[PDB]
Design a protein around this ligand. Structure first.
Ligand SMILES: C[N+]1(C)CCC[C@H]1C(=O)O
Ligand SMILES: C[N+]1(C)CCC[C@H]1C(=O)O
Ligand SMILES: C[N+]1(C)CCC[C@H]1C(=O)O
Ligand SMILES: C[N+]1(C)CCC[C@H]1C(=O)O
Ligand SMILES: [Mg+2]
Ligand SMILES: [Mg+2]
Ligand SMILES: [Mg+2]
Ligand SMILES: [Mg+2]
Ligand SMILES: [Mg+2]
Ligand SMILES: [Mg+2]
Ligand SMILES: [Mg+2]
Ligand SMILES: [Mg+2]
Ligand SMILES: [Mg+2]
Ligand SMILES: [Mg+2]
Lengths: 369, 369, 369, 369
């Protein structure tokens, strides 16, 4: 089988009741990029990449489309049923840009699943769970307000909460953490506190030192892995990497040298499902819990995250985060990804189990044949 | 789909022109263990595990059969199309015993390939090369005799040689290395020198120190990874791990802490194809060349090694070693694995591409349903 | 003063006597991106960024233009005479993408120099030398052909040569190094050998071990800084970082932990002149020799590299590499950067000292006001 | 342009309501040294260096004047518009003595700013803030007395307090810290506790161990960087370096090896504004908060500190400390540096924005032409 066509789409995603405030990025609307790969036979697979604002990570919508434009001509004729060979071919056309490569990777897995009549999770090792936990991530806000939302989302069924902090005096972050804990203690809910690269080591040290009785993991408190490695021995809370986990090589360093206790991992950042599966296997060998998330996006990226999420050993699964609650219009009205009771059901159909309504996207902004 | 039956077989393989002498194991004949998994549909898949004598590694033929007998009843009804789920189910029945688990893993991949109409290499990421390099491993012997054999094997087309050493005064090993190099220098042939756990650090240091102009990698010179880690900074030849690479966790330590420059990796030791693919991905991220080998065995294990080997980035592929030259009777005379010109052509059919003449194996020593 | 307009240009530069072969990138023509910043006063400054093919580094021409388009609207009204404030403003609009940010940075320095009537080198600490050394980088090729070219370039007056290697059996690289040394020994010519991320540690170890009598520095032998850190203690030749030196934070790690002995540093990679000056100061504090280069490009980027190069302590200056010998048409035929006798004379006028014939560039692909 | 004359002045600064008590130095009056550089054109720039007693650091007033006398003849004819070239010229005349070199560096930046018509901050990267935070540093005193002063200075508007400790039993220091915290908790005021090289590791360990709920950073608790590195892993409060930060090389060690969480940095110690800017850039890359201070002195050194302070990323700016509150007579009655509301306004004029009344200083004690 061979790739005959590649189509790139641009589509807007307004944030319901926005904005969503991360210490590194405040977003009111998101520009997603969809990719459709069409085989010689006419069979199609879909991929998606949607950076969460241009300042969260070294990625942006215009950049995704430029990277896809660079690679697409060189991918016509490739075998989409060989995800590792396909990844190497992409590497031969463009260095880096994992967030764009991931959209091609995902579309190829979708296509492969449809061709063989198999769910993507069953091409990645097998479904370990049909119902996948999610987690709720609060935007930065006022301490009492965030504590209220925390309680609300626990009641909805989320087994884990992530509280975003930073970009303001750390005593306000600490007050927020204490107030959230007062609401959720005794509910069996797991807690993560995400600094999103924004805390100097001075403040990360203080946050952990002041709160030994509060069982958070501290997610990406500082900007660089170098800073995190420097503070780790002085911090008695588990530390998770997120933004620092840019590639498999960095994951190997972190796990092999004992630099973290877990990960928030984004599928587009690591470069797609082929790489994400290897990441999963590394974490399982070292009992490092992790999530399977992305920055943002609709049914296509959400389904990809859910499929890899469904393969994770349940005791290590910190959840699959999706943007669905903030997105008004699903691409697949029948079988799109939906959070229910703080969890996500894996789609039943072959491939990703998603069939997007292309008419929602408008005509492609770029087509390659 | 579900596993309906599991059949375990004992089969003998005497060494042509034996014995084969490893510093840790001398063998005149080998006892292999075959596994047949039968689905409800009637479709079957094959696996194999064959320790190279009982002293090379913590594994033996009677042990392989004991481990399989322990796990088999608990695997009836499992979905054979989910290799990671299947591995976890095995872990729930028996701790360790990767060499036995690998036989089930391989049979599952064979079954998956047959069911979907796909080659096993394509289920593991894709065929990067239809023909893979092999390497010739010499036995321990007289320096000039080993040098003659080395020259002969280069003339046959082997792109790499592994010279076994140890178990005698190291000056004889050094003379062997020097005489081999005299005959193969300028042929572009790669060289490995394998101590097979037998050299005290005293002698590993001496071998490297005396021969800076000879471009070998030093494979498993010392018994423990601890000894290797202690000598590495004082040894200017690349060092490869073989026997020490017992699981993915150990590979993560070695790669993440920079304890070696490559691997001789055995499929059964790491626990099968699911784990081997993860191993491959770790090595590729860090440009660590490796082989895809096993201890011994016929067409089934050989085909499994060849399939994973066919997925490796060619610049990192140190070869696929197979016991075929020492085995009188192939399981599959039409499609069985054969070395030609120091290389191995990947089988072209679905699954492993191997159809063993099951009659050769005798009745099962144990059957489960 | 305020930015009134920003104009982005696409322009082609085919390689004379191409292609130019790097182990990580082979190129027959280059697409450069020019930026013109216009102040309210009407005064203009120029910047440039030109990746050397899309596979050398995580940067490409379409990406440079996407990044500039993303940032430009948010820069209208900014004070162009404040390079650090301007860099922070860019960081607030787009994460990463140093190669694109560098073009804005360079245009700002050009504008500042023109406004104050000062050469850019004097804004960066002062002209230490009116004429700076360059170095010649050979392509990958036959050992004796590369040796001939090396001899020719020494006769032209180049004080340093960089021999590119990798992407083939290392014995050929070693033969190349030996044949080059045979021809240039005793001429006082400095030697670097650049693996361009392509050597497994196995081969980097071998190259150094075999050639202690040849005084090269080994530049970016391996792909990751992690691999380089692992081999450094076993390699007795100085090791320089190039591609790994992605930002000032990484330079701080490398200098502070003693991970390298020098740098091949590219202005666009580090993010522009503001960051490059800090880099220079770090290297001077630790006596780490370095070059001031870029990936490719015409008079604008070349002049920027020459200006920072002119500020470096002469004993630490490994040279300024420019693409001029491979470029048919200069932007400025009166003052453009040219190699003469293996060295480069700094332009004498204010700003970068370059007045590009803007007509050459075509209409802007994007304009902002 | 060229230096035509250098004039060195001696001037006394009585401590208002003295003495000021540091654990390493008690001072009743300070001897400052002013430097005037006059260009061929007649244009002048001013610098200043004022050690805070002869025992605080390896520097003293008689030593400043001796160092300037050594260097001045060798600086006549130099280009004062090239601060890095000028620094190298000074290094070629005298090793070390940064505190004296800094006065020349500052005078040259002043001159450069006047010549180009630009504020010194805009020659160092640009004004990031017109109003710069300061911090108040209490001398050593009785616990209740210091707590009262702490409350008073918070009310005046200082966003940060530094409490000096040491030279007495540590339980008194701990009582002081607790009493200060009781007064300032809930005011959003940041806290530093400065041991000024005086605590044995025994007592630094105790101070941190006993007070996890008090959010100080521990500034230079021990005498040597070696002692600080030894205790750092056992101390859960952020540790800042001050006296140990003697040069850029030491800063590179501290940041690269993760030996501290921030700095109190003195402009004269680091060697002037050229070096201070590089220091600032290193800290910004690693999110290490820092102050921009000096040991003591009037309008000239204060303005230099304010100018570099105005370029610091606001979230990393721990403040600019100046001696103004303790100095009765400003050099520039109109535009001298004044603390107002715990903050300092950047002068508006070119150069440092300061014009000293030379008649206050008396005739030069040494003149060079
Ligand atoms: C909550 N998230 C999964 C969504 C956007 C950022 C990310 C995180 O930083 O964890
Ligand atoms: C060469 N071999 C693959 C064959 C058996 C042992 C093994 C080795 O020690 O490398
Ligand atoms: C020689 N160069 C400056 C030119 C392009 C790549 C580069 C280098 O790798 O060093
Ligand atoms: C408070 N100070 C800025 C002024 C003199 C000493 C110094 C300090 O040690 O932090
Ligand atoms: Mg719950
Ligand atoms: Mg996160
Ligand atoms: Mg077509
Ligand atoms: Mg050959
Ligand atoms: Mg071996
Ligand atoms: Mg010469
Ligand atoms: Mg290079
Ligand atoms: Mg206040
Ligand atoms: Mg201090
Ligand atoms: Mg004179």
């Amino acid at each position: 089988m061979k790739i005959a066509e590649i189509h790139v789409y641009a589509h807007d995603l307004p944030v319901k009741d926005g904005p969503y405030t991360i210490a590194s990025s405040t977003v009111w609307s998101l520009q997603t990029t969809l990719v459709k790969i069409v085989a010689d036979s006419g069979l199609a697979g879909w991929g998606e990449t949607c950076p969460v604002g241009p300042t969260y990570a070294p990625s942006h919508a215009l950049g995704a489309r430029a990277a896809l434009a660079e690679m697409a001509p060189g991918l016509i004729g490739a075998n989409p049923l060989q995800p590792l060979v396909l990844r190497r071919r992409m590497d031969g056309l463009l260095c880096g840009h994992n967030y764009a490569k991931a959209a091609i990777d995902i579309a190829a897995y979708d296509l492969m699943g449809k061709h063989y009549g198999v769910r993507v999770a069953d091409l990645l090792g097998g479904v370990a769970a049909e119902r996948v936990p999610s987690y709720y991530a609060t935007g930065i806000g006022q301490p009492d307000e965030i504590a209220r939302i925390a309680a609300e989302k626990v009641a909805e069924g989320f087994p884990r909460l992530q509280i975003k902090i930073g970009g303001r005096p750390v005593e306000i972050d600490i007050e927020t953490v204490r107030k959230v804990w007062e609401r959720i203690r005794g509910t069996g809910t797991r807690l993560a506190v995400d600094g999103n690269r924004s805390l100097p080591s001075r403040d990360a040290l203080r946050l952990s030192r002041e709160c030994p009785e509060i069982p958070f993991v501290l997610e990406q408190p500082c900007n660089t892995l170098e800073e995190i490695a420097a503070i780790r021995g002085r911090v008695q809370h588990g530390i998770y990497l997120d933004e620092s986990g840019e590639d498999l090589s960095t994951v190997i360093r972190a796990a092999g040298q004992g630099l973290c206790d877990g990960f928030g991992m984004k599928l587009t950042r690591i470069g797609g499902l082929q790489q994400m599966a290897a990441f999963r296997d590394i974490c399982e060998a070292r009992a490092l819990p992790h999530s399977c998330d992305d920055a943002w996006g609709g049914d296509i990226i959400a389904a990809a995250c859910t499929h890899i999420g469904a393969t994770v050993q349940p005791r290590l699964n910190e959840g699959v985060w999706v943007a669905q609650p903030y997105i008004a219009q699903p691409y697949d009205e029948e079988n799109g990804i939906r959070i229910a009771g703080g969890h996500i059901d894996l789609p039943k159909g072959p491939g990703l189990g998603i069939t997007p309504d292309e008419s929602l996207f408008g005509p492609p902004v770029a087509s390659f044949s």
